Amino acid sequence: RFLKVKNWETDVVLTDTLHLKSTLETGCTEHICMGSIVLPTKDQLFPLAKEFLDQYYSSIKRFGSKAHMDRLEEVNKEIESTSTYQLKDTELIYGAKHAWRNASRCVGRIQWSKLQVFDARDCTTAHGMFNYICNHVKYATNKGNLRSAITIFPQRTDGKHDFRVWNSQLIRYAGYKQPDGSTLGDPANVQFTEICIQQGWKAPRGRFDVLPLLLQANGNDPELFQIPPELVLEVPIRHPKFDWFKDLGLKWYGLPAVSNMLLEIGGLEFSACPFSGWYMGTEIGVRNYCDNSRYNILEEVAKKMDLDMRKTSSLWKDQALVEINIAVLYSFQSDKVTIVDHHSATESFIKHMENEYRCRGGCPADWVWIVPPMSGSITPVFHQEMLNYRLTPSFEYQPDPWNTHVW
Amino acid sequence: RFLKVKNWETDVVLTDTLHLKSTLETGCTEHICMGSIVLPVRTKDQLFPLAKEFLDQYYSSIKRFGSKAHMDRLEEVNKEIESTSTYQLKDTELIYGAKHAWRNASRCVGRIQWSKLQVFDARDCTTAHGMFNYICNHVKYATNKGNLRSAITIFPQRTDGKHDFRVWNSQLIRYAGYKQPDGSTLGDPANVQFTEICIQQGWKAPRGRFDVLPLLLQANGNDPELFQIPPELVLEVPIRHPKFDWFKDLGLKWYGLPAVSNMLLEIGGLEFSACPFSGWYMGTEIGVRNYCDNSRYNILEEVAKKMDLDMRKTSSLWKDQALVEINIAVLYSFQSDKVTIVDHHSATESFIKHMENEYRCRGGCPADWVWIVPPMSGSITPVFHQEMLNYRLTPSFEYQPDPWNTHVWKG
Ligand code: HEM
Ligand code: HEM
Ligand SMILES: Cc1cc(N)nc(C[C@H]2CNC[C@H]2OCCNCCc2cccc(F)c2)c1
Ligand SMILES: Cc1cc(N)nc(C[C@H]2CNC[C@H]2OCCNCCc2cccc(F)c2)c1
Ligand SMILES: C[C@H](O)[C@H](O)[C@H]1CNc2nc(N)[nH]c(=O)c2N1
Ligand SMILES: C[C@H](O)[C@H](O)[C@H]1CNc2nc(N)[nH]c(=O)c2N1
Ligand SMILES: [Zn+2]
């Protein structure tokens, strides 16, 4: 019922009680661990609403106060007659901040309480959505001094009137299959790129073409829009010691902004809730640049470093990985664009985890995702036992809209 | 019910049915994943079904399920359980048992090799000196002058839990750790407690950074006694770097034979509490963990110092730069001295081929991602991108409490 987590580098032991709150299911059983799987009515809504308002009023030190009870009845009455309900601004902000706080896969949660929340619940059209997104992008970008933000479109109703951003992130590079059999640009985005092409985008067909936004308001067919190029802060990638690195022609965007997740607060479902912070270096240098199924540049870089690629045991992939990552961090720093290295990020998360254990009685954490994709064991999170469980408010994955949406 | 796992690099999707044979529990529930927690006298009653399951598996694999020899063996085991409270494994069942415990070890990346395991039957052993002799033979056989061979030696099973055979060392070969009065540690800080115990048992400690510990060996529930492994039996590799000539002056070395001696081997309900086993190293175990963990030799600072890296900001990735160089040095040193070692690229590619093979021929391969993914360069190894299902099959190796915590001292 109570559970201990040990850090095997420091011997520091923490006791978790927060897990006894969790309701949603992990995918694991007593018989099987699914820890490494990427994806494992009116009557439904009121317990959900109640459970959320209870944690809200307890957080503002007013649990069981008349103002608490009154709000419970007003929501109960609104559900009974409207089959849904509306969140107060204060509840919206709290819900969003807590969905981030509860994101067990996110290493950057030390920052959870400083999230700028933009309420776009009054939005009605895709042109409206575009305006809100551009304002979000400009606000978060802040000329390189990045700030966390989320923008929240109207909640689901009958599920036939969904707001969706079809893009997976607000800013991403296009992907084309070429006659060659090779891929130009980002292979992750090939399918979405074609969907933009069949919707009518003129594609420049380069390595680093910023995709257009494809915006669905109120269940209607989605619409193309190009983000003013002047709102998209990008960094050219160079190396502090290797002069040849510039000729690889590498660039990345400053703003990571996930736009395909669903935000659930008090049983209400916000299907379009783009949010953004800033990069940890490895996301770009390890995953985007080096995954065999992404830009996959390890082979090209190793060649320029004149390393022995004859045998895997020369650790040439590993040498090139480090240098690719040094260059990402150097480039973002030199251009004054916020970025965090994996040493700094994981050390912060350990500090945050200790805060959450003393202040909240726990911190749900998914070790498979929190440990960086390079140098795992020289980061302190490697040695940290973590407990993974699902709390609400939360961000969840949802089906790609094109599989779903009817034209 | 069939369970699917997907490789996110290749889109290969595999179907697991083997998890259906899984008996033991994971630590996890529908409400909590304990996937990163390091650790989350049997009676006649419980013993017969365990013996029966095991023998059903054995007889299946040799294609004799339901045979008169299968039925006769069940009845003979049954009769022996009721009459004596335990039973004895045939040699063939012991071999099969030991190979399967390795096959089932979900935290082990080296399993492609599971079927080539030299089993030494030491169930006729009775004394600590007998144990020492069996262990020297294992070490010489396994070492094979650098062309390492996988092996396990199996001492007598638990009886009443008062007569246990235990190897008190956690590996057959490991270096002492000495905690100094100024709070520094000389040698391997992981072995401080055990070293203290050796010392108190009368070991005279050289007190260097690389003193090979003595063996502390318990037979038949008796008090353990000290033995020194003959030095000529302990193959060691001095560590140098192919390009950096100052690397050798760090004074590093490591032993070639990794030989886990503190686990419990369970087969058909029987408990083998001393069953040391050994293979060969994957380079990262030494280069990443043993050398670079902050709680271990911790040489990152001193290495990066000698590499003249920028150390005033973590964002120069100086730690990462030094880590790779150390790992290069380890592999180079082993290869140069013709001592078997495997790099993490090669080992993980092998594991993936093993795992796909196992799904096809066996209907699954239990695997613990937290453990299989190497402690450096995770995502450029194909395992990182592999979904895995973790569950407990028997035969199995299990953790057991350190014997100094449980042992009843006789005097
Ligand atoms: C501010 C600096 C931040 C950093 C350094 C950061 C870091 C990360 C990283 C490295 C991941 C792993 C994702 C992957 O590898 O694909 C992640 C996941 C995630 N983060 Fe953050 N984060 C930040 C801000 C935010 C904010 C503002 C939110 C929401 C308000 C958020 C919510 C999430 C969620 C929901 C996931 C899981 C995505 C998934 O399951 O695929 N993060 N975070
Ligand atoms: C042939 C060469 C082998 C290689 C390269 C190899 C590789 C490894 C590695 C890297 C680990 C993780 C250890 C750690 O980081 O703490 C491990 C764990 C393990 N291996 Fe192997 N292995 C080999 C052979 C064997 C053999 C012969 C056995 C026994 C028959 C064995 C059984 C195990 C077990 C039971 C674990 C789990 C240890 C634990 O939970 O602490 N392996 N293997
Ligand atoms: C807000 C924020 C800040 C930050 N630094 N980093 C992030 C994660 C972003 C960026 N870097 C990856 C992306 O993570 C979000 C995408 N999650 C992948 C899960 C997935 C499941 C199934 C199929 C797939 F192809 C992918 C968010
Ligand atoms: C047979 C074989 C071959 C090989 N290459 N590698 C191995 C694992 C060895 C080597 N390198 C580490 C050790 O693994 C065995 C010890 N396992 C640690 C688990 C643990 C539990 C509780 C507390 C702890 F601090 C640690 C075995
Ligand atoms: C199969 C495995 O679960 C998958 O590759 C995961 C592993 N850990 C991860 N960790 C992070 N931060 N991001 C990812 O995309 C993944 N992928
Ligand atoms: C807390 C965490 O599970 C622990 O540090 C584990 C992580 N993965 C590991 N993986 C291997 N192979 N060996 C280890 O010792 C560990 N340590
Ligand atoms: Zn689990």
Swiss-Prot record, chain B:
* Predominant location: membrane
Write out the residues that bind (6R)-L-erythro-5,6,7,8-tetrahydrobiopterin: S36, V370, W371, F384
Concerning its family, UniProt says: Belongs to the NOS family.
Any idea which positions bind heme b? C108, Y399
Where in the body, by tissue, does this protein show up?
Isoform N-NOS-1 is expressed in brain and colorectum. Found in the Auerbach's plexus of the enteric nervous system. Isoform PNNOS is expressed in the penis, urethra, prostate, and skeletal muscle, and coexists with the cerebellar nnos in the pelvic plexus, bladder and liver, and is detectable in the cerebellum.
Query: Could you say which residues of the full protein are shown?
Result: 299 to 718 of 1429
Keyword Metal-binding attributed: yes
Question: Posttranslational modification, per the record?
Answer: Ubiquitinated; mediated by STUB1/CHIP in the presence of Hsp70 and Hsp40 (in vitro).
Localisation: Cell membrane, Sarcolemma; Cell projection, Dendritic spine
For this UniProt entry, the molecular function terms from Gene Ontology, in alphabetical order, are: ATPase binding; cadmium ion binding; calcium-dependent protein binding; calmodulin binding; enzyme binding; flavin adenine dinucleotide binding; FMN binding; heme binding
Query: What job does the chain carry out?
Result: Produces nitric oxide (NO) which is a messenger molecule with diverse functions throughout the body. In the brain and peripheral nervous system, NO displays many properties of a neurotransmitter. Inhibitory transmitter for non-adrenergic and non-cholinergic nerves in the colorectum. Probably has nitrosylase activity and mediates cysteine S-nitrosylation of cytoplasmic target proteins such SRR. Inhibitory transmitter for non-adrenergic and non-cholinergic nerves in the colorectum.
Give the GO cellular component terms, alphabetically: azurophil granule; calyx of Held; caveola; cell periphery; cytoplasm; cytoskeleton; cytosol; dendrite
Protein's name in the database: Nitric oxide synthase 1
Q: How does it assemble?
A: Homodimer. Interacts with DLG4 (via N-terminal tandem pair of PDZ domains); the interaction possibly being prevented by the association between NOS1 and CAPON. Forms a ternary complex with CAPON and RASD1. Forms a ternary complex with CAPON and SYN1. Interacts with ZDHHC23. Interacts with NOSIP; which may impair its synaptic location. Interacts with HTR4. Interacts with SLC6A4. Interacts with VAC14.
One of the GO BP terms on file: xenobiotic catabolic process
User: Per UniProt, where does L-arginine bind?
Assistant: Q171, W280, Y281, E285
Question: What's the superkingdom here?
Answer: Eukaryota
Q: Which UniProt keywords apply?
A: Calmodulin-binding, Cell membrane, Cell projection, FAD, Flavoprotein, FMN, Heme, Iron, Membrane, Metal-binding, NADP, Oxidoreductase, Phosphoprotein, Synapse, Ubl conjugation
Q: What is known of its domains?
A: The PDZ domain participates in protein-protein interaction, and is responsible for targeting nNos to synaptic membranes. Mediates interaction with VAC14.
